[PDB]
Amino acid sequence: KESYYSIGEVSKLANVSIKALRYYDKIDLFKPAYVDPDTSYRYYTDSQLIHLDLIKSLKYIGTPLEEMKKAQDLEMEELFAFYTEQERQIREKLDFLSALEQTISLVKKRMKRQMEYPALGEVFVLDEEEIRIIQTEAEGIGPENVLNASYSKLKKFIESADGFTNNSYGATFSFQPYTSIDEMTYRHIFTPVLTNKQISSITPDMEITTIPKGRYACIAYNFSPEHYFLNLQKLIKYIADRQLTVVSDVYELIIPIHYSPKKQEEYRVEMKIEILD
Amino acid sequence: KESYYSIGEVSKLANVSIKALRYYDKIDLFKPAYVDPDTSYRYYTDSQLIHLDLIKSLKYIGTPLEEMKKAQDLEMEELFAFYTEQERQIREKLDFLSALEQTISLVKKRMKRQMEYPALGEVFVLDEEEIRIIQTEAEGIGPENVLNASYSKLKKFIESADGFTNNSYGATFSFQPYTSIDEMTYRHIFTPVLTNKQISSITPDMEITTIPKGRYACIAYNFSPEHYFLNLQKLIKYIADRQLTVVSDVYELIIPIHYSPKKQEEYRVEMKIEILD
DNA sequence: TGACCCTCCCCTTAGGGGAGGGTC
DNA sequence: TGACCCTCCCCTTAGGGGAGGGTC
Numbered sequence: 001k002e003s004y005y006s007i008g009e010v011s012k013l014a015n016v017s018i019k020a021l022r023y024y025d026k027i028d029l030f031k032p033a034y035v036d037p038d039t040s041y042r043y044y045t046d047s048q049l050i051h052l053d054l055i056k057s058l059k060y061i062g063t064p065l066e067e068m069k070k071a072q073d074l075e076m077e078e079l080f081a082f083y084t085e086q087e088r089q090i091r092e093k094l095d096f097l098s099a100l101e102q103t104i105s106l107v108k109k110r111m112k113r114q115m116e117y118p119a120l121g122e123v124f125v126l127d128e129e130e131i132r133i134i135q136t137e138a139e140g141i142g143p144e145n146v147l148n149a150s151y152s153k154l155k156k157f158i159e160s161a162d163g164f165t166n167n168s169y170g171a172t173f174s175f176q177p178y179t180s181i182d183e184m185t186y187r188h189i190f191t192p193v194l195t196n197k198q199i200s201s202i203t204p205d206m207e208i209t210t211i212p213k214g215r216y217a218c219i220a221y222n223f224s225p226e227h228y229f230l231n232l233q234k235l236i237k238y239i240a241d242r243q244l245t246v247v248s249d250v251y252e253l254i255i256p257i258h259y260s261p262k263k264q265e266e267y268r269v270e271m272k273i274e275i276l277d
Numbered sequence: 278k279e280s281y282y283s284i285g286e287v288s289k290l291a292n293v294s295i296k297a298l299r300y301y302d303k304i305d306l307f308k309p310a311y312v313d314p315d316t317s318y319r320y321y322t323d324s325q326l327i328h329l330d331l332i333k334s335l336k337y338i339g340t341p342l343e344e345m346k347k348a349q350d351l352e353m354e355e356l357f358a359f360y361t362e363q364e365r366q367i368r369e370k371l372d373f374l375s376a377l378e379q380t381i382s383l384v385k386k387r388m389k390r391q392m393e394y395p396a397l398g399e400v401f402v403l404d405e406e407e408i409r410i411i412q413t414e415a416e417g418i419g420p421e422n423v424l425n426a427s428y429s430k431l432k433k434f435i436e437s438a439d440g441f442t443n444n445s446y447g448a449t450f451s452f453q454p455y456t457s458i459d460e461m462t463y464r465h466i467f468t469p470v471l472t473n474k475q476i477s478s479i480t481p482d483m484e485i486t487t488i489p490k491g492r493y494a495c496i497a498y499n500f501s502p503e504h505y506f507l508n509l510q511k512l513i514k515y516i517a518d519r520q521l522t523v524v525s526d527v528y529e530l531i532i533p534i535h536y537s538p539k540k541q542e543e544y545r546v547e548m549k550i551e552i553l554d
Numbered sequence: 555t556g557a558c559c560c561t562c563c564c565c566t567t568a569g570g571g572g573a574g575g576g577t578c
Numbered sequence: 579t580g581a582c583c584c585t586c587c588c589c590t591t592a593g594g595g596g597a598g599g600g601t602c
């Protein structure tokens with residue numbers, strides 16, 4: 001071959017855009033063998049096309065362009081090693097996605113349950129599967145003064161293990177025949193965990209524990225101040241009327257119904273307490 | 278809570294950079310509840326922090342920011358569906374990586390073999406595993422006039438199934454006791470395939486076939502014009518001397534030793550021909 | 555006074571999409 | 579004359595890193 005291909009010809013032959021070729025030229029990754037000193041037209045030799053092989057392959061596996069420059073200088077012995085590295089980075093991506101895929105599925109599972117709920121505003125008993133959680137003591141906090149900020153450390157922690165930060169906020173309190181909200185004080189506030197990912201060195205002010213599998217007397221509803229205490233009361237009454245035995249704190253879970261800064265915020269609230277008989 | 282968090286406070290609480298908050302502000306994704314009309318300082322309410330939950334989660338799974346705007350307007354019923362979509366896109370990514378991971382491994386396998394080679398310039402017989410390939414007739418082409426461009430359609434095709442374009446170039450020719458290069462003409466030129474990926478509607482001028490598993494008389498060496506024909510001759514002689522029976526065309530494979538536009542190009546050449554006795 | 559916050563401004567990666575003007 | 583090619587120039591995404599100057 002003693003001619004020359006024009007940019008368009010290379011483009012059509014190698015299945016690479018003309019823009020790409022001009023760019024690889026500027027980058028000094030793949031430069032035409034000859035540039036007409038007047039028209040500036042780019043001209044390529046046939047033998048030179050071989051170099052687009054490595055470039056197109058590396059582009060396919062995501063290698064950044066500047067990285068390619070040092071990959072072409074390596075050499076069949078080291079290129080083998082180079083690939084070994086790309087592999088390790090690929091399995092890294094894979095592991096990440098698999099984990100991610102598992103998490104999304106769990107979020108969806110829990111998300112679906114809050115949609116299958118028997119009825120709102122009514123107490124009912126059901127067999128629950130366990131729920132892993134991370135908690136910390138409430139230090140004075142109660143329904144009237146809890147803040148999103150109160151969950152900062154817990155969230156920082158779960159975020160580090162799940163990536164997918166928590167959706168629901170939890171709190172617990174002693175099952176008592178309260179007569180007023182102000183009488184209530186939280187024992188712990190918690191956020192459920194979604195991963196069995198070996199917790200990133202948990203500090204001792206946090207406790208990894210669980211809302212155990214068992215029978216629970218529950219009530220769920222869409223939050224409204226003049227409903228919070230009444231639903232609690234329905235739970236208290238329900239348990240007293242059928243003489244049930246409470247064997248846990250009252251578990252309280254709050255989950256936003258939407259995250260739109262545009263519409264009036266609304267929350268789903270759920271109170272459950274484990275029972276025996 | 279009847280105060281206000283400053284940008285720095287939100288940053289520390291939600292584990293999101295200050296720059297990020299300013300940006301989410303500009304984008305109109307997450308805007309502070311209040312902006313001091315004089316200092317321009319941004320101020321946020323505690324209740325508002327809840328919105329960073331969805332945002333941080335979507336950012337974790339790769340959802341583009343502008344996409345988030347429409348995700349917050351959706352609503353626990355549709356958000357479920359939204360996640361289902363993200364899942365489908367995640368498995369898409371996974372499948373891609375797995376395939377990619379398999380390919381890289383095969384490239385490495387073949388790449389290693391050409392490094393384990395017994396010796397260069399010497400004929401030797403070995404048991405080969407099959408090699409899938411895609412070929413087309415050579416139409417007159419021979420060792421003296423083959424061009425990289427000659428492989429354009431074949432490459433376009435393999436690229437579509439492997440992503441990782443071919444590394445080696447092949448050709449075949451009738452086993453004859455040639456006395457000169459010019460007497461040689463290729464029957465087919467081919468590129469090996471690396472994927473069992475249902476070939477993207479192959480046209481009939483191409484043939485999916487194989488260099489079959491079997492015993493081959495081979496010779497590999499680093500290309501040099503005044504060596505090409507001599508090595509062929511060593512093969513011819515080797516086969517005649519031990520009276521072997523040839524049962525295939527001569528398979529010729531060329532692979533660049535490096536893809537550096539900076540150093541003198543060099544190639545590994547390999548000729549193999551299947552035999553019986 | 556230190557921290558804290560704000561508004562530019564430049565910069566990163568891999569080209570795609572023109573617009574205006576030559577060029578086999 | 580159509581195709582073909584070239585050189586700007588603007589633009590995309592998600593902020594990070596300052597620089598210069600106010601601000602609890």
Ligand SMILES: CCNc1cc2oc3c/c(=[NH+]/CC)c(C)cc-3c(-c3ccccc3C(=O)OCC)c2cc1C
Binds near residue numbers: 146
């Ligand atoms: C077990 C999960 N724990 C939580 C429990 C909560 O119980 C609350 C009871 C109330 N009771 C009246 C008797 C009122 C007024 C607000 C409450 C908030 C609240 C705080 C700040 C801004 C908005 C809200 C808010 O509107 O939250 C919806 C529950 C709240 C928040 C969390 C995290």
Ligand SMILES: CCNc1cc2oc3c/c(=[NH+]/CC)c(C)cc-3c(-c3ccccc3C(=O)OCC)c2cc1C
Binds near residue numbers: 420425446448529
């Ligand atoms: C089975 C694979 N098929 C191929 C076989 C080939 O055999 C060749 C034999 C030769 N023999 C002299 C008797 C010479 C001179 C060049 C050859 C080239 C070649 C063509 C253009 C630019 C550089 C080279 C080049 O330098 O290629 C290295 C082989 C070549 C290319 C391919 C794809």
